């Protein structure tokens, strides 16, 4: 296939972009590195079946983009990824996440596209769910302004479906972690813990440390994205993850079993539009796509680790 | 209460300021006259609890007009309210109709404003429901770009709620009718029904005229905005209706008999992002807020079509 990925110089972006070629695509990564690492795409400056174009998916001229490169599906991993940024600044986060969405979608029903692959925020939109782990058929209820545009950008998606025939399928990931996710943040907590502890420098969990995410490896992640852009699930939501849950002061654990040394982080003030708890049920990305996570989390740890460690 | 009203200089804006004003608040209109009009908020220039400030909620400094005003209730009605304008600009619908909340709900949150009664669209944020009349319960399916952007607002407001507890409800019209309605307007069949067979000059009716609509005078809209207003339905969105269906074709036939004149409407092609039915449930309304309709199509029309004969 031709492929488009938006977000392409970011953790799960190039990670997507790998993977994409090594099946045979050709691939248009894109990114205005916002958040994302030329570093992240930097091997590929030799690979014949990629090209980057740099572009805010806000601003840019996304029909041009796509007019020239003609992909038959964009995967959409451009966004504002941090939840207290998108509490501080709701309308940037907004501007991103949601008109960004609009504006690609305007672009590609206009440009031949087949589908469009958005990434959602499983581990956010469902709020306090009525159960764990949660179903898509949970109600949303977001409970930060990121949470919210990730929603609005589902229905914006599906509304172009109604529309023009514009196939979209919605990726909702737990909590994603594994090589390339930024160390130097304030989301990425496997990433954060990793480099800190390898460095001896402080780390830190919030509240009472006992927060609940869904931990799901990058690899496993990328390989429901490729699953979904054939013609299956379209105007639907895949939650992908692996329904268990870990708390801050558990992966903190885990992460110093790996690194070595003090099992120890400061507890510092609650993080408000932070979720107390998110637990996914995945038993539908199983049955319509075989999708199922590979990697858990002792193993994804170790791989994470290692590979900060070099 | 000190209330403030975006989209003021507009068609029910306008007509809410007046009832707020009639109940004894005071008032703040917002608008940038994008769709409104001087001629709605004329009569108030010497009414001294009324202010208007023209400001794009895209662009103006929300957090210092809030400061500056103190509102207890935003009333929350300033949108891009075409459809086809949407679908033709969806970029554009979404900033004023996403990031113009957005904006709203973030200067409201720091200026000790109570509540937000948002506005959506009943008639659109359904799409083709397995029941009608639609209750609130039923799924949302946005099939025009203008409707997914309510659908959005109501959410982002839903949200700022569980954040700071900023109070939201969101009022969502069926089809809103009645004087001041924009007789020009590229929206608003009872208007430019009226507008045209008054002046003698064609008119259209979409497909074979046989969609629904559920339409709803603007006074009624209005005392529901009234009473949402209070400390009340917090997080709840309520439907805003007669709860009847009327055909286009059968509406022309209703505006034509209130009119005189012959009732004889071209059939044009149907336009992308249009409902073919649309007819709101409003026992939530009823049962919380004590809401029900009062004016009735025929009674309404007539109202509408004297509204437009004194011009
Ligand atoms: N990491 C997770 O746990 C997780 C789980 C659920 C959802 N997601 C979603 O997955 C996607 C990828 O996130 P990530 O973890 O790889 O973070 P990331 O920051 O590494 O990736 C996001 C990428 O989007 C780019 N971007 C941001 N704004 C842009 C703009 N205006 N124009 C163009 N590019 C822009 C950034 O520069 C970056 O390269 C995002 O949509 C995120 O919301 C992430
Ligand atoms: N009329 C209906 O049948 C109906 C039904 C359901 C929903 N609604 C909603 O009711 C509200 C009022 O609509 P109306 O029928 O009075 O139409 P209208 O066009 O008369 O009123 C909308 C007003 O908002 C103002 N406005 C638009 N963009 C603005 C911006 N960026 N900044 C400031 N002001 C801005 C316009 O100038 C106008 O005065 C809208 O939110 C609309 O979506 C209308
Ligand atoms: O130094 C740190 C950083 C984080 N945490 C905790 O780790 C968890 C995860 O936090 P973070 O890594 O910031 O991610 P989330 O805010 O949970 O959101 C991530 O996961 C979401 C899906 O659930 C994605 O949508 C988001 O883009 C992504 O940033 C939380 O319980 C935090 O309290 C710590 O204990 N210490
Ligand atoms: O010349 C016309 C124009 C319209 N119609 C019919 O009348 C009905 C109503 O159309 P409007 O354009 O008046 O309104 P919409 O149903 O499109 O309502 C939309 O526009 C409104 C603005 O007036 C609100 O914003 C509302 O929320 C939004 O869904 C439709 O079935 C349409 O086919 C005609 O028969 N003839």
């Given at each position: 296939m031709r492929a488009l990925v938006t977000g392409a110089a970011g953790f799960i972006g190039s990670t997507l972009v790998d993977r994409l070629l090594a099946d045979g695509h050709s691939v248009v990564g894109l990114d205005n590195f916002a958040t994302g690492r030329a570093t992240n795409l930097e091997?590929?400056?030799?690979?014949?079946?990629h090209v980057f174009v740099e572009a805010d998916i806000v601003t840019a001229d996304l029909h041009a983009i796509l007019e020239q490169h003609?992909?038959?599906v964009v995967f959409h991993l451009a966004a504002q990824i941090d939840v207290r940024r998108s509490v501080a600044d709701p309308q940037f986060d907004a501007a991103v996440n949601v008109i960004g969405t609009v504006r690609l979608a305007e672009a590609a029903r206009q440009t031949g596209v087949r589908k469009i692959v958005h990434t959602s925020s499983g581990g956010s939109i469902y709020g306090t769910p009525p159960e764990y782990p949660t179903p898509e058929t949970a109600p949303t209820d977001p409970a930060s302004p990121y949470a919210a545009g990730k929603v609005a950008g589902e229905i914006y998606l599906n509304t172009f479906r109604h529309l023009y025939g514009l196939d979209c399928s919605h990726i909702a990931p737990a909590n994603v972690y594994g090589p390339r996710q930024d160390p130097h943040g304030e989301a990425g907590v496997v990433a954060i813990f990793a480099q800190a502890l390898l460095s001896g420098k402080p780390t830190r969990v919030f509240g009472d440390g006992t927060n609940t995410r869904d931990y799901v490896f990058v690899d496993d992640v990328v390989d429901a994205f490729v699953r979904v852009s054939a013609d299956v699930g379209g105007g639907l939501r895949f939650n992908i993850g692996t329904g268990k849950e870990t708390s801050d002061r558990q992966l903190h654990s885990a992460v110093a079993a790996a690194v070595g040394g003090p099992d120890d982080p400061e507890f510092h003030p609650p993080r408000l539009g932070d979720l107390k708890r998110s637990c996914l049920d995945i038993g539908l990305a199983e049955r319509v796509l075989g999708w199922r996570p590979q990697i858990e989390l002792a193993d994804g740890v170790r791989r994470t680790v290692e590979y900060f460690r070099h």
């Open positions: 091997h590929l400056a030799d690979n014949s079946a003609r992909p038959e």
